[PDB]
Amino acid sequence: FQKKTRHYFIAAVERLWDYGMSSGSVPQFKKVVFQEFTDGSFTQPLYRGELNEHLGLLGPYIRAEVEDNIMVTFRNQASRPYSFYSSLISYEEDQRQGAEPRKNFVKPNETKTYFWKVQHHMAPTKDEFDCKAWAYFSDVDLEKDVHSGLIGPLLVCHTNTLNPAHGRQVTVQEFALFLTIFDETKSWYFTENMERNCRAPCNIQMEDPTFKENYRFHAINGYIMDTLPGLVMAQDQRIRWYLLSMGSNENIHSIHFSGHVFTVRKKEEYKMALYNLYPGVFETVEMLPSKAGIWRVECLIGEHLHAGMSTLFLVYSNKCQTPLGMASGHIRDFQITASGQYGQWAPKLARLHYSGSINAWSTKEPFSWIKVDLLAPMIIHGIKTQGARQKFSSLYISQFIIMYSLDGKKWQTYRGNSTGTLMVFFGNVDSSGIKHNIFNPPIIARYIRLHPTHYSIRSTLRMELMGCDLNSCSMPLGMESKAISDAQITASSYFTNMFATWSPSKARLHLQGRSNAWRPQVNNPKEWLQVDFQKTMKVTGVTTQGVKSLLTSMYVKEFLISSSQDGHQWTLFFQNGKVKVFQGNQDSFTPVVNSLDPPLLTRYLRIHPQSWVHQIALRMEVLGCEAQDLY
């Protein structure tokens, strides 16, 4: 086992503070930040990857093991000269000097490079956690250069805890949180007051009730409206939080995570619900967020919450993963706007498995792409990609990058875990190369673009998408797997003779047999089918289908639904007006992505067939999970 000398080519720049969410007069701000670069030629901005964009308005992670080497080759690009500084900044020896100028001063465009053994001084212990947390900042003016914007995180780890894959991850997933209350009586703000907000309509409020950051700034980074971005995590892979409060002498912040609890180490490990962060106390704490769905972090301190801490975080299950609907989707959903053409057109028809000669996407275009409006912010875990087949020609796409938009306006590229600059994806190899790609960290988007990086004869594609809703649990409730017993379903009545028993206990999304579905004794609209969950459930929607009776076709064309808590009296389903006329089947086979506007919370679900084909015939399935149990 070895030691490593890990440099970090890092600098200090500016841009600053955006708000635009929903909650336009918005102000420009021009504070300073740290920024990680690519090498000594300080060029590549080093795109902030999906895995660490929570970091956002502060500096990049600097990381080391025990018996290690830390190095910083630093360039300043700004007005007021700044500097790197933390605790273990173990300088060395002595000099022919005048009372020891040990002053660290980094003038603009000059390069001050420093590097030092990171002794067990900075290390966490056998009593402690897999990693401790430390701050770096500019010490030119520790007072101002903190409201200015040179907050930075530093991680010091046990030996054999990091990776080739950069950073750590042995059931890890880390996040830093940077709670200050920024203020601009600090750092060059003069070049803001009369830079923006003022021209010939000026001379309004000098320092009287104007307080422009006690008008706003209550940081959890500086994406701290009442919403900052990158809090993505798997509802198990137990997450370590790096809480470091900074600022002034009112900057106590007492943070917690609703409906979650975490453990802190010290002497031992003892369990806690919220932590009075202090200025200068760099907390590490871990938790196992075993409650799925969508939550938030808030500094519980009354007046702090009410001007910017209610800042969301999301937990998904990864036991949720259904095809997002490319067979079961949207007849001719979305495609492109010029990228894509060849008679036998683009999507319109670029789905996975689509049989025929006129089948899939098709463009001899060096600059190409396709676009899917998922019609809602969605979790996308992966993408099954495949190719087509020509005259006698094997043609497919061999390489691709994946961009996404959550909004439609500002896009960007992708950086699946710790890759490089840009996440290069490997295509197919033939005309049936189903190369199910998974998104290492997931993606939350509404739009996805696929861009070819090499093709066969034409940039040629057919594809499906993996994922599901934030957690509207788009996962089969148990009709298919038969987690719901044959006992657990009755119907209004069942057809039965000798050569058949089309009992309710058969209504199953794909079921073969002689009597392979549910059928009512006779045909009435006031006829129904009833699932009983032996507990209280949440529902996305019911997947319907008909039967192949070897006789003739049989399926249900339109239906209604009813809900109950008691299981003996029924409050049925509604639109925004009258009852919901449900868009049902049209064949012996083929299922129906038929879901519900208000997710229905119930335990007794009844299907109400309205219009049908030849007889009323049902093979089906429910999608969902469960909230609380009954009460």
Partner: protein
């Protein structure tokens, strides 16, 4: 088991003749019928609700108020069909209705303790947690919605049906009636105090004497407003990390315990200058009981209290009107390096109080370094040699009695009271026992101090300070006693407020030239004597000499500089306080804490404090490091 708590929330009128709120009721309803546990310690408190590791609690709140009011937990898990917290957690129709109980509503509550939120292997038998209400966090609170919520291991219903425990919930809380539900003319809204028991108000009950009493203590407020709480006996649970005085901030709860002596209803401070006047108080009647139907050292100190002169900034001086530092000292004419007349403790050789004790020009103003391990006895023989009379009391030990007798100076209720005039000498006995010393957890030497107590700071501020060290047992045995135990060294973070000093205008006829305009009480002049310093030395005035590879403990405290706390600095250096490694020490105004440090970073280091609004008002020193010899 499966627990239910059918209790809604109400509007009530409050008192101890000023101020009426909205509370958190207690009642057995299906409608609106009386039901009360509250008599004693229960102030404004939704009933202390208790659930064990594996259980499932069902609060159903019936709302009655002009208020839209919620119910929201902490330390517990639940479904997005509770939480009781409005904001877009995506939440379908019925999943948001928990988030805000529309005024005069009604809603059920789904609460779970899993294994993952029960209390850790080794810590508090039973965890401190509260139950809030948040629609408008600021409003819902200051108004008066808060209750206690406890959670702990498999056995309350079964091992408190058979076990005896003395436990209360003390709600250290600061409601501000200007931030209430509520909104010529001269008298705008106010309060600030414990359990809801104002000013000096007292609540209710006590616990038995010969054993221990546990309190789940819930910190409160709607602002960053720190406290520091005391009474007699040590308050040793934090973990079994063993603490001088419960120290409470914004929103805080961990849970702590103490022992007892007898009936003496013990005094209950918030003990800070600002919070004081409008402060928190309560008693404790410690009564008799229902349930019965290489040895120890002997230390010696001859100390005198004695008047001298103090130059806060001798070594370095460079003033005019040239700075904020230029302004300091005597805001008339005189204003250079700053000289005042102080009265600091100083020890002598023997009863013949003659031989000057060679001083420690690093401890500046500080008293002689007092030390005594568990088991020892301090015979502290004390002369006043300053006109305006004072005494000596150690914040630390509890067995402090005049040497020879168990008398009380002919008249007073206890020694930190009135005794010792100019001239006269008193022989005091300080006996130190295991209870006031460290433990198998702490450091081995907790940090404490002695003030004088004839006046509080109208004493202290004028110079009456000295470091008291209480320690674990050891002598050529125990741990770390084979070649040497490297010396003891103290830093004291102190703002001296000359503006209060018992040498007030004495000092103005002195250093200040002419009182020919005898001006007093002023904007800038009052600020001109608030002396933020470390050991009297200020503005990088006498730093400290040390060297590299050298290694020993620092003992540090905050005294006199109150109203606020101190995060404390040390450039490039890092310490092992509480056997973790942190780089900054947060310090209250009680604040006794004990760090440890491997000195091996050669150079100038700007020791000060992590707060950059005093370290400019002075409040910094330097430290030097370079190889030695031996």
């Amino acid at each position: 088991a499966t627990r239910r708590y059918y209790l809604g929330a109400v509007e009530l009128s409050w008192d101890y003749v000023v101020y009426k709120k909205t509370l958190f009721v207690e009642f057995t309803d299906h409608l609106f019928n009386i039901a009360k546990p509250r008599p004693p310690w229960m102030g404004l408190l939704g009933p202390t609700i208790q659930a064990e590791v594996y259980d499932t609690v069902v609060i159903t709140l019936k709302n009655m108020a002009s208020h839209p009011v919620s119910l929201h937990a902490v330390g517990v898990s639940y479904w997005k069909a509770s939480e009781g917290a409005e904001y877009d957690d995506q939440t379908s129709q019925r999943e948001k209705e928990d988030d805000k109980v529309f005024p005069g509503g009604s809603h059920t509550y789904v609460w779970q303790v899993l294994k993952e939120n029960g209390p850790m292997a080794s810590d508090p038998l039973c965890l401190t947690y509260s139950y809030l209400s948040h629609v408008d966090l600021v409003k819902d609170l200051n108004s008066g919605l808060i209750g206690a919520l406890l959670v702990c291991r498999e056995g309350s219903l079964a091992k408190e049906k058979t076990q005896t425990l003395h436990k209360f919930i003390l709600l250290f809380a600061v409601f501000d009636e200007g931030k209430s539900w509520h909104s010529s003319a001269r008298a705008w809204p106010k309060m600030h105090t414990v359990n809801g028991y104002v000013n000096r108000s007292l609540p209710g009950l006590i616990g038995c004497h010969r054993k221990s009493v546990y309190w789940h203590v819930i910190g409160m407020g709607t602002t960053p407003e720190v406290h520091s709480i005391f009474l007699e006996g040590h308050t040793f649970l934090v973990r079994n990390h063993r603490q001088a005085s419960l120290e409470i901030s914004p929103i805080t709860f961990l849970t702590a315990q103490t022992l007892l002596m007898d009936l003496g209803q013990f005094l209950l401070f918030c003990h800070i200058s600002s919070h004081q006047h409008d402060g928190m108080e309560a008693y404790v009647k410690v009564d008799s009981c229902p349930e019965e139907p290489k040895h120890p050292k002997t230390w010696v100190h001859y100390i005198a209290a004695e008047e001298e002169d103090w130059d806060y900034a001798p070594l370095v001086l460079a003033p005019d009107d040239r700075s904020y530092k230029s302004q300091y000292l005597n805001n008339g004419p005189q204003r250079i390096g700053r000289k005042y007349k102080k009265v600091r403790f100083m020890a002598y050789t023997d009863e013949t109080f003659k031989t000057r004790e060679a001083i420690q020009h690093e401890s500046g103003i500080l008293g002689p370094l007092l030390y005594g391990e568990v088991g020892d006895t301090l015979l502290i023989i004390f002369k006043n040699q300053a006109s305006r009379p004072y005494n000596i009391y150690p914040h630390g030990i509890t067995d402090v009695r005049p040497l020879y007798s168990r008398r009380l100076p002919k008249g007073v209720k206890h020694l930190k009271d009135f005794p010792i005039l100019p001239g006269e000498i008193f022989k005091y006995k300080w006996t130190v026992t295991v209870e006031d010393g460290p433990t198998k957890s702490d450091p081995r030497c907790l940090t404490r101090y002695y003030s004088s107590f004839v006046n509080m700071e109208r004493d202290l501020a004028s110079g009456l300070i000295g470091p008291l060290l209480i320690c674990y047992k050891e002598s050529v045995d125990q741990r770390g006693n084979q070649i040497m135990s490297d010396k003891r060294n103290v830093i004291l973070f102190s703002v001296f407020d000359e503006n209060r000093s018992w040498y007030l205008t004495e000092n103005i006829q002195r250093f200040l030239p002419n009182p020919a305009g005898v001006q007093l009480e002023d904007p800038e002049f009052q600020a001109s004597n608030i002396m933020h310093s470390i050991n009297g030395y200020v503005f990088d005035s006498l730093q400290l000499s040390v060297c590299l590879h050298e290694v020993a403990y620092w003992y540090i405290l905050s005294i006199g500089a109150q109203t606020d706390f101190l995060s404390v600095f040390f450039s490039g250096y890092t310490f092992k306080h509480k056997m973790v490694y942190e780089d900054t020490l947060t310090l209250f105004p009680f604040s006794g804490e004990t760090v440890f440090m491997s000195m091996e970073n050669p150079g100038l280091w700007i020791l000060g404090c992590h707060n950059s609004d005093f370290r400019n008002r002075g409040m910094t020193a330097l430290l030097k490091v370079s190889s030695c010899d031996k």
